[PDB]
Design a protein around this ligand. Structure first.
Ligand SMILES: O=c1ccn([C@@H]2O[C@H](COP(=O)(O)OP(=O)(O)O)[C@@H](O)[C@H]2O)c(=O)[nH]1
Length: 469
């Protein structure tokens, strides 16, 4: 694959590399990195879906070497012609981003080992785990997840001699069927991890089959190496049929070489992580741990190093976080049907007595995700004894971008009563939490689930002096 090297480029060649048309005079340009308009340094190239006259002016003032865009708005084209700002007009802007990744890897981090992580849920945790295992061992690594890939990669590569790229690839506004394929092709990873496919907002706007097909593109992009696939998720299990000839399928999950059983994690039927080292863990946590171990075995990381990384991993925020032990308070950002199912089942597995499930409606996200989330909560609790559901709008703690609308609250509560689910409702999160805390027993379990509506829970629970217990 022909990717240019060096800090100089011909504008018409750049245009060809990104499948675009140069608007302006061809010339050789000095190139910095691919950046955003807001951070662009002189000679940087900016890829931006939309541009307007003010953007063109900013690009001129920042001495951007070239602007690549799909939608020049207003008179920006003629304005850029006036200001002599080179514009490359593309029909499919993701081709430019893919070129930027490939070029950035080649020019700033060519000798790296690379892993791509995709899936509906668990992407960020799994990426974070893999990244932590490597950096805990002293390896220099880049990841695009926080606790434009080309931009972030260049910035870190300019600061250290990277050995590993650990890149999370997401599903998308319009679901593009080749998004994961093209991004994975541009990274050329040794290992692709797929955590799961599940119903989320993109699947609802499109379909779960189109999300599965888009996700599987990351596996189809592999011509060598390892596809690390969650056996316990039917969609990712199916992608084993989609691997190319020389790609090794590496299943993790039940009856797989990396597996969780008898409370512990086993590798090739040898005990690897004892149950003593996995207290108060969720289903997703275990599955993500199996994925991260599998990825690192496929990178030939010595097992003692994997294990040290696993034992020192610090989870991301609101990943089944234990806020209190008596009562057991669990804070989880579960926000789509599969996440809510796993959170409740994992909470029930740890529940001595009564299970309290406090759930914040996903305000300003539509009726359908809320109906299905309420559906998942209902079906999951139907096979569970000794529970109580507290639904909240969190009107007291959410901003206007996350406010629960009238139709969203109705469909959520309508679904609950449709399934004979006994529930209490409260507009305020403070009231939902207080009523739960004043009515629960010391040996109960309180599971808090939700997105932005539940983010303020732990800070609120501190104001009412229930944590630290
Ligand atoms: O076509 C454009 C592109 C960018 N900007 C401004 O340039 C700044 C930086 O834009 P960038 O894409 O770097 O980050 P954003 O704010 O869009 O997330 C923003 O405050 C934008 O308002 C503008 O006025 N017109």
């Amino acid at each position: 694959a022909a990717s240019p090297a060096g800090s100089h480029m011909r504008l018409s060649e750049l245009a060809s590399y990104v499948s675009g048309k140069l608007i302006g005079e061809d010339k050789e340009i000095k190139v910095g990195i691919f950046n955003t308009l807001g951070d662009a340094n002189p000679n940087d190239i900016v890829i931006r879906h939309w541009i307007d006259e003010k953007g063109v002016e900013i690009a001129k003032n920042k001495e951007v070497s070239a602007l690549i865009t799909q939608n020049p708005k207003g008179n920006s084209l003629e304005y850029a012609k006036k200001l002599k700002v080179p514009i490359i007009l593309v029909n499919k802007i993701e081709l430019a981003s893919a070129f930027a990744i490939k070029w950035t890897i080649k020019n700033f981090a060519p000798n790296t080992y690379r892993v791509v992580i995709t899936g509906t849920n668990g992407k960020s945790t799994t990426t974070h785990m893999i990244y932590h295992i490597l950096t805990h061992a002293g390896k220099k690594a880049f990841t695009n997840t926080d606790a434009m890939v080309a931009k972030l990669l260049a910035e870190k590569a300019k600061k250290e001699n990277l050995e590993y790229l650990v890149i999370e690839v997401s599903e998308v506004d319009r679901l593009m069927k080749d998004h994961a394929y093209l991004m994975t092709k541009s990274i050329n990873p040794n290992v692709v991890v797929v955590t799961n496919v599940a119903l989320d907002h993109i699947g609802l706007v499109n379909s779960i089959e189109e999300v599965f097909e888009e996700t599987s593109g990351a596996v189809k992009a592999l011509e060598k190496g390892f596809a690390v696939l969650n056996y316990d998720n039917e969609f990712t299990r199916k992608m084993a049929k989609l691997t190319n000839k020389n790609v090794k399928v590496f299943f993790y999950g039940k009856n797989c070489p990396v597996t969780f059983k008898s409370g512990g994690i086993y590798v090739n039927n040898d005990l690897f992580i004892k149950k003593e080292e996995l207290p108060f863990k969720s289903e997703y946590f275990i599955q993500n741990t199996l994925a991260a171990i599998s990825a690192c075995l496929c990178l030939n990381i010595p097992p003692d190093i994997i294990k040290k990384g696993i034992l020192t991993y610090k989870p991301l925020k609101r990943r089944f976080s234990i806020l209190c032990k008596k009562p057991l308070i669990i804070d989880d950002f579960a926000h789509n049907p599969d996440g809510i199912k796993m959170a409740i089942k994992s909470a029930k597995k740890l529940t001595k007595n009564k299970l309290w499930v406090v759930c914040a409606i996903r305000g300003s996200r539509g009726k359908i995700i809320n109906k299905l989330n309420a559906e998942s909560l209902s079906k999951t609790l139907k096979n569970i004894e000794n529970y109580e559901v507290v639904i909240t709008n969190s009107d007291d703690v959410v901003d206007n971008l996350n406010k629960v609308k009238k139709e969203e609250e109705k469909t959520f509560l309508k679904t609950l009563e449709k399934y004979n689910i006994n529930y209490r409702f409260h507009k305020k999160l403070k009231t939902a939490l207080e009523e739960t805390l004043t009515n629960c027993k010391k040996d109960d379990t309180i599971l808090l689930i939700g997105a932005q509506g539940m983010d303020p829970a732990s800070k609120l629970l501190k104001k009412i002096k229930v944590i630290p217990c």
